Amino acid sequence: PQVELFVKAGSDGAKIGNCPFSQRLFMVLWLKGVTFNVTTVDTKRRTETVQKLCPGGQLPFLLYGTEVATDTNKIEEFLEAVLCPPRYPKLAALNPESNTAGLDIFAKFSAYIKNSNPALNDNLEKGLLKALKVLDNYLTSPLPEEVDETSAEDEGVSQRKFLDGNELTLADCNLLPKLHIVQVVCKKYRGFTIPEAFRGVHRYLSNAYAREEFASTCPDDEEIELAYEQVA
């Protein structure tokens, strides 16, 4: 059945633009293994067919067969329900927590890079670091799955590669596009890196950049930077 993902185009009007929700759905379709095409949209230069299929004008939108669906969270949950075993993998996380870990990081990052008032920098910046610390923590925590400490040098420390285990889940699809923007924009504009002592975070990102599902759906570094150039 025909699946076509509609995504934000970049500065040139055709390459993929900055947008973590676009990325998340793209990551979702990839991970399902279902065939799909992907279509980039210029919102200041909308095609006949784009107008015609989403008059509401929303991005991202999904065309499934002939039925249009909007709202990232709803499109994801639909795809998950629809694309089922035994044909397609279940992708939801198994630990309700994997769904909320790091969930507050993006807003904190946003409040921070948008702020222009020097006097209130340290608050926002320390808040962002704290929410990274809350994620790092979740990542180093052994999950129920694990419940076994093989090494002695690292007792009580998690070995897993992603939020919910050793496999990419729905939760990753949501956090990694957002985590990635955060890292790109903060580095570029402020010289702020995720401290190296956040070893869980750094392990997590090394593993996810070694997944083609994440790496090939990442907009150009340059494109994220341009998109944040004004607010920064």
UniProtKB/Swiss-Prot annotation:
- Tell me where in or outside the cell this protein is found: Nucleus; Nucleus membrane; Cytoplasm; Cell membrane
Q: How is its activity regulated?
A: The oxidoreductase activity is inhibited by rapamycin, amphotericin B and IAA-94. The channel conductance is regulated by pH and redox membrane potential. Inhibited by IAA-94.
Primary subcellular site in the record, as a coarse category: nucleus
Any GO molecular function: oxidoreductase activity
Ligand binding (glutathione) = 19, 59, 72
* Substrates-to-products reaction catalysed: L-dehydroascorbate + 2 glutathione = glutathione disulfide + L-ascorbate; chloride(in) = chloride(out); iodide(out) = iodide(in); thiocyanate(in) = thiocyanate(out)
Region (Required for insertion into the membrane), start-end ranges: 1-85
Q: How is it modified after translation?
A: Hydrogen peroxide treatment causes a conformation change, leading to dimerization and formation of an intramolecular disulfide bond between Cys-19 and Cys-54.
Please describe, based on the UniProt annotation, the reported consequence of changing residue 54 to A. Answer: Loss of glutathione-dependent oxidoreductase activity
Q: Which GO terms describe its biological process?
A: chloride transport; platelet aggregation; positive regulation of osteoblast differentiation; regulation of mitochondrial membrane potential; signal transduction
Expression sites by tissue: Expression is prominent in heart, placenta, liver, kidney and pancreas.
Q: Which residues carry this modification: Phosphoserine?
A: 116, 151, 206
The note filed under miscellaneous reads:
The protein seems to have very low affinity for glutathione, even though glutathione binding was observed in protein crystals.
Its biological function? In the soluble state, catalyzes glutaredoxin-like thiol disulfide exchange reactions with reduced glutathione as electron donor. Reduces selenite and dehydroascorbate and may act as an antioxidant during oxidative stress response. Can insert into membranes and form voltage-dependent multi-ion conductive channels. Membrane insertion seems to be redox-regulated and may occur only under oxidizing conditions. Involved in regulation of the cell cycle.
- Please report the name of this protein according to its UniProt entry: Chloride intracellular channel protein 1
